[PDB]
Amino acid sequence: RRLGVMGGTFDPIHYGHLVAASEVADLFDLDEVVFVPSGQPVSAAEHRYLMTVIATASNPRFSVSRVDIDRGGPTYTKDTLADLHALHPDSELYFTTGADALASIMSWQGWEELFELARFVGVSRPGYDALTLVEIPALAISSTDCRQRAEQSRPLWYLMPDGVVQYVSKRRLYT
Ligand SMILES: NC(=O)c1ccc[n+]([C@@H]2O[C@H](COP(=O)([O-])OP(=O)(O)OC[C@H]3O[C@@H](n4cnc5c(N)ncnc54)[C@H](OP(=O)(O)O)[C@@H]3O)[C@@H](O)[C@H]2O)c1
Numbered sequence: 001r002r003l004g005v006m007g008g009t010f011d012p013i014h015y016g017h018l019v020a021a022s023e024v025a026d027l028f029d030l031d032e033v034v035f036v037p038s039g040q041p042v043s044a045a046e047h048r049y050l051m052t053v054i055a056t057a058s059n060p061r062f063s064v065s066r067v068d069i070d071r072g073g074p075t076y077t078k079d080t081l082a083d084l085h086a087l088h089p090d091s092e093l094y095f096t097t098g099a100d101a102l103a104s105i106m107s108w109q110g111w112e113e114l115f116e117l118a119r120f121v122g123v124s125r126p127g128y129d130a131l132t133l134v135e136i137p138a139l140a141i142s143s144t145d146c147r148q149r150a151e152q153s154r155p156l157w158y159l160m161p162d163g164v165v166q167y168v169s170k171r172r173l174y175t
């Protein structure tokens with residue numbers, strides 16, 4: 001059994017993330033991908049959790065975990081991987097996040113134990129065994145650009161699911 005772990009802030013989640021998760025699951029024959037919004041270091045954790053639930057609900061092989069949000073302090077991936085390993089003891093873990101996030105991995109706590117717990121996948125827009133880098137054209141879509149568009153009342157339609165567009169708008173997240 002093989003479980004993707006999509007780690008990120010997801011403020012907001014967008015089609016880039018969803019495309020990336022879908023491709024990585026196909027590339028590595030993953031049975032499921034669990035999205036793990038990171039803890040409060042940015043919109044409140046509950047907003048980021050709900051947007052990610054909204055965005056992933058329709059995919060039978062996506063889910064969302066609260067392990068980082070409910071942990072208590074800032075998020076360290078050694079703790080995310082320990083929590084998920086305890087929850088899914090039989091699954092091989094494929095930790096997936098932005099390649100630019102993973103460029104600082106040598107400063108993350110438990111750097112050596114991280115690779116005992118998971119294989120790592122860095123996804124990026126084009127032109128960027130233990131770490132595999134994967135280029136995803138749809139990751140040209142960025143959460144920063146999404147927040148700026150919302151701030152400027154420019155449309156978010158087709159950059160993320162309709163439910164996320166409307167959540168961002170009616171909860172006034174970036175205005
Ligand atoms: N001490 C540690 O253990 C440590 C330190 C740093 C990070 N991390 C972990 O690394 C993950 C990423 O951290 P972060 O969100 O802080 O990164 P970030 O700095 O917000 O993101 C950096 C880049 O990665 C992209 N990105 C982030 N998550 C992604 C995903 N799941 N798929 C595709 N692109 C992604 C971002 O694009 P968007 O803005 O479009 O998402 C951005 O281009 C989190 O799970 C975090 O807990 C751990």
Ligand SMILES: [Cl-]
Nearest residue numbers: 053062063064
């Ligand atoms: Cl879920």
